[PDB]
Amino acid sequence: NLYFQGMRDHVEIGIGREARRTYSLDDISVVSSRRTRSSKDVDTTWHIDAYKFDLPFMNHPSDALASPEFVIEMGKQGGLGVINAEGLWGRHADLDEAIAKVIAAYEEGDQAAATRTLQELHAAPLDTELLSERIAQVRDSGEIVAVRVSPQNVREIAPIVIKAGADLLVIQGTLISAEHVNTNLKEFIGSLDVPVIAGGVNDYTTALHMMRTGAVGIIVGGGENTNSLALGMEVSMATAIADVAAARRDYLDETGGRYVHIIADGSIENSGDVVKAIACGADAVVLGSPLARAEEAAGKGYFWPAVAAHPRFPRGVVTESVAAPSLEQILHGPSTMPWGVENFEGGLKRALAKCGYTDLKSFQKVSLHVN
Amino acid sequence: NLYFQGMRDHVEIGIGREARRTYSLDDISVVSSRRTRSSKDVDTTWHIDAYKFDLPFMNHPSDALASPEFVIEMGKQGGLGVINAEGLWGRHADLDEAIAKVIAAYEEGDQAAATRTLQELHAAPLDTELLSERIAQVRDSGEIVAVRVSPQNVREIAPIVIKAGADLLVIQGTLISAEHVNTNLKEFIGSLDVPVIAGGVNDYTTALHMMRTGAVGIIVGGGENTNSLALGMEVSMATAIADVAAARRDYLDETGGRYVHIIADGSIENSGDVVKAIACGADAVVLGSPLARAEEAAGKGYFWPAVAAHPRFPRGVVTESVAAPSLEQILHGPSTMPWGVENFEGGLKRALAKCGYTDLKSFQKVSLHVN
Amino acid sequence: NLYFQGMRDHVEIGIGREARRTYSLDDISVVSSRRTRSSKDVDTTWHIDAYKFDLPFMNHPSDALASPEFVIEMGKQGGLGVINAEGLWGRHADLDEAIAKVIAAYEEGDQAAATRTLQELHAAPLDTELLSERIAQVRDSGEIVAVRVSPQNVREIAPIVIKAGADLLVIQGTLISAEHVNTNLKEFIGSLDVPVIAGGVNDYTTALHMMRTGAVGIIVGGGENTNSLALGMEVSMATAIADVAAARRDYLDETGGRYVHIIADGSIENSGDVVKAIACGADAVVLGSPLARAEEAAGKGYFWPAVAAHPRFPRGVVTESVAAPSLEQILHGPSTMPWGVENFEGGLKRALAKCGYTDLKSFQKVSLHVN
Amino acid sequence: NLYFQGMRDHVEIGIGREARRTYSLDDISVVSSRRTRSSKDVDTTWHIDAYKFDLPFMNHPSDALASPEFVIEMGKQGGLGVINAEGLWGRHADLDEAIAKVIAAYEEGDQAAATRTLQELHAAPLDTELLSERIAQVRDSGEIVAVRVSPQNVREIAPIVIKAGADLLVIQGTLISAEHVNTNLKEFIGSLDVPVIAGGVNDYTTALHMMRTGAVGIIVGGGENTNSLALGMEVSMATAIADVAAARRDYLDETGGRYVHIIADGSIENSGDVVKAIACGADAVVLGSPLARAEEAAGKGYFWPAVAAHPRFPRGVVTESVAAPSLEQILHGPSTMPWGVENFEGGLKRALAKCGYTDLKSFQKVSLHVN
Q1: Around Cβ B158, how many Cβ atoms within 10 Å?
Q2: Cβ separation of C35 and D317 shorter than 8 Å?
Q3: Which of D8, D204, D350 sits opposite A231 (nearest CB)?
Q4: Same domain, A75 and A15
Q5: Same domain, B77 and B1
Q6: Contact D249 A14 (CB under 8 A)
Q7: Which domain holds residue B9?
Q8: Cα angle vertex C75, ends C69, C78, to 5°?
């Protein structure tokens, strides 16, 4: 079986060189083989660590979305709001003014001026007291405080943001490993009194090693980026989620029950993509660019990942969305758009119900087609 | 054989996760391996229950097509006219005025205003006496009266439309199951004195269970909808028709001869798509958007499925067609367009004849290519 | 071997329904594994029946190309000129005027007016004396006279065109069979004193039966047409040429040496397509739309197949090409365009030479890639 | 294994005709399965013959890039500058004026006038003293002098360019073989006192024979050309690099250690393509059209291969790029563009580091995905 399956799943690229066939969310679809259920009976609650969210959604931690206002509203709307500790929050007193400059640059001088402007704004020094002040606004709302730090600066910044009120620490790059060789993360994560979500991790082995650090969640994928063009690396999200889910299953066995959550970030533009991510093994999803249309989004319709601001090798671009709906409408409807970019909750519940499922974990076994 | 075939027809998406390879009508083509026949010798008659139609065609039951005028003309032209009981017919005294508002909204404010306008018009209460009056116009023509009801409201609405003159009841959603769990259909169908066509059903098991309810026909596919984007569900029509045909074959055996018709609705834009649907196992086809060009179509060139009007989660859009031909010309020619959107009869007969077949049932065994 | 190969070359479309995987010219490419040869050493001569052509090319017999002038020039330039007996030649005294009307209709009213105009012009009665007069112009030039007749009217028209001077009879439809059932061709072909080329034939069995009629050549493919959209039939030319070549090999064995030529018509836009057709087994190729750019082409840059003029079910469209080059330049260069649409001879010879071959028959064994 | 693998890697095109499945750089991606390294620890040095280049890059030898200024700057920036001996350098006293005419022709009269203008400029006689003068400018800079000659004229031109100062001879056509039959290269290469790089070679056998001539490097691929359209030949670069790498491995064994470099030229538009080429087995890469944006590029944003100028069968086109960056910025950054067309060094190092590698040779074993 594994002999013939591996034969089928691999190709000879050339004499003495093989590759593994892998799949994107666009390559697959979910199938109804069961008696249909009612969408009103579908449970979309997300239980992670000590938290229960109404929706299995976290925003991507880019400043294009995540003003303090937005983060609080994400929590009010049933999801997990996530802050970028290392973007514009601690670097510019007037956060709206900084965002406005990126927008102006994009409209006046395309993605080139936008990149240049992002590079300059992110090059300004990080004022930890200003960052802490903004985190306190989120904390004082009563919503759960999740703060993202880069793998590069986690040891320096994590204690500052935890002191400021972070309930959950997100260590997120487009790609992370548990062990890095320079010129450990287990002890560091073990030392914290807050749960940690870490990523991006796209392979089984790296995932398993990351789970062994004590992380409560693993982010699969790299969000929005230009890695395919710049690095020749393109995550096949269906395969990546499924492989990381296999690591989760094996880690559950090895520990006798510790359940590490799989959170998909990448290739997610609509509610169908969310459905497919859950089907592949994800417990939850990061929503990025679809939330840029929200009235509350800091970037007014524009989106960019943090990696768009790298000073030497930017790997992201500013995109613009295609009267703004509220974040509530985007997440809960009523939808006035049939393209799956509003009422994410409704689409998720209807898909599960049509397929005969009433909870997210069970839906990870739904039948799949590859088209 | 089944071991290696299943190996070939499945893929490993990732570690411990498999998917079935499936196919669309666009993926396939019909092949001539036989002595050619004459198109004048090809029989396209469709014998279902007590009816014999000249053409194996029914219109999709959306108001964009199905005014009383249109429905009658579909019957006059040799097909089966189908009415939407739950659209605009019972909700607005002036049906042309209601249609005009959707058109105006689309031209003035794109698919957003169209969706909003459809949502509002469908939210108006259903007057069963107004609906019955319109059904009576169709009944009084002498054409066969087919009326569609949603799975949701079939128990309430079916008896009203049967009383009004329905000869055939169509229970149609984008996806239906024989058994639904809320918070049976066999007894209900068995209680009626009219034949029932039910769908959409896309899988073998659901089809077999639906056949066991007493339905005389099964609709395969979901018509036009945005399920791929909104739910992550995309019907692979070639595979779906073939799978439902296998259920039909097995149901024929189990009952000793009861023949349930397979009617394809989805992925059908031209006469070649119709040919391919029959080749895969369909006895007949629903024609939707291609008929929107007809002079008699209520929507004047525009099309939309009923699901475009859902108040919380619309899953369809208003499309516009690319001096109107008559429905007669669209169905029987002479065609002045070589793209397969007129003279559907002619294309079907010519395809069968070129492939060496003179009837629709036999054509279900034609050789296929996958390109 | 055949068990596993057939498994690999077939797919399960659905439960109990299979299809054969097939390939287009666009799917393949020719490979150099040998010592390179010089293009000046490559022999492109085409020896068929009693004729030797400098180039293995015949024009597609549509009036958009084939005025008497053009046909003669095709012969002067080293190929085989082919006349449509059943187009405009015998139907309109002023052939340029008729062509001008199609052009005017296309520019003034798109493909709809063009179709309508073609339908009307072809509906005018065929004057056999006018047709014979035009054929005599070609005959009197000293070039080889090839005349195409439809399968439908071959018994009526073939003797007229042979009397008028035809040296070769081409019986061409988009698809032909040796035996047709209505409401034989062997005896008919056997009765003629001229060699016969017949097609289109795309399958092994039909080809073998057509070879047994006495035909000296088989046309594979249907030229330009809308069969994919109108009939759900799309020829996979790489597979079709290869399958018909297998019939040729077997027919050669069965007869002890009778060699039936394979002439590809379909999917041929550039010199690379020609190369690929020969690689798959073709002895020669029909050039259609690429020749419409020739100064001598009757249609002044426009192209259409005869099937664009069918009165009830047209299956072709008028296309327009993208200071006219001469037919000599298109066939022999010098090319000033690097896209393979001029100097067809040069491209063919260079491809063979780069691959290590110096004649067309040997090149049918060249290594292939599927991309 | 080889039985089933070959079955899997081949397809039946038709009865009795097979093809090999092959792959492009676009079909693949590189995978991180290891602990990540730091990009500052990645060694990108290229050791070939007696030379050590900071970057594993050579420019494509077309005049659109390679003025003497540009060639020198390529060397100053850490790569290998390569001169076309047979382009405009020896044919026109005023090289900028000649380039200006191609640009003018392209802007005023599209790719047709550009082709015609290139044909005429290249038809002017080669003045070996003018060529030698320009080569001397490069030589006097102190940078390494690499000069390209065509396979056609290598015996005549190679001694002239070596006398003028060439340190490395590049014998480059879109496709070359070790042995050519007209109407040897080992002795010729063996007679020279300079190392030789030869190509394009895309297959194992031709590569092995070319290695046996004494060449120190093999160019895989044909640069930019229209061979797919004109000849029906399209190089699948992933497969071609891998196959030529297998020849390199076997040649290393047969000789007991002679290492022939693999240099990819074709399908390389961005840093991700470079990464993928190295992963497939390349030691270095030719950069062509991406360098046309450099302020120092002779063609001011325009690019063309030498084969665009062929007098009878041109196989290339003039393309235009989409305030000019310096060549330094294109090769070393800082990048202000996230699409992988600047800071090639940075992208290469970051990709290796993310995948867990610190040198180019080791990276040839990185895991691959086929998407």
Answers
A1: 22
A2: no
A3: D350
A4: no
A5: no
A6: no
A7: 1-21
A8: 140
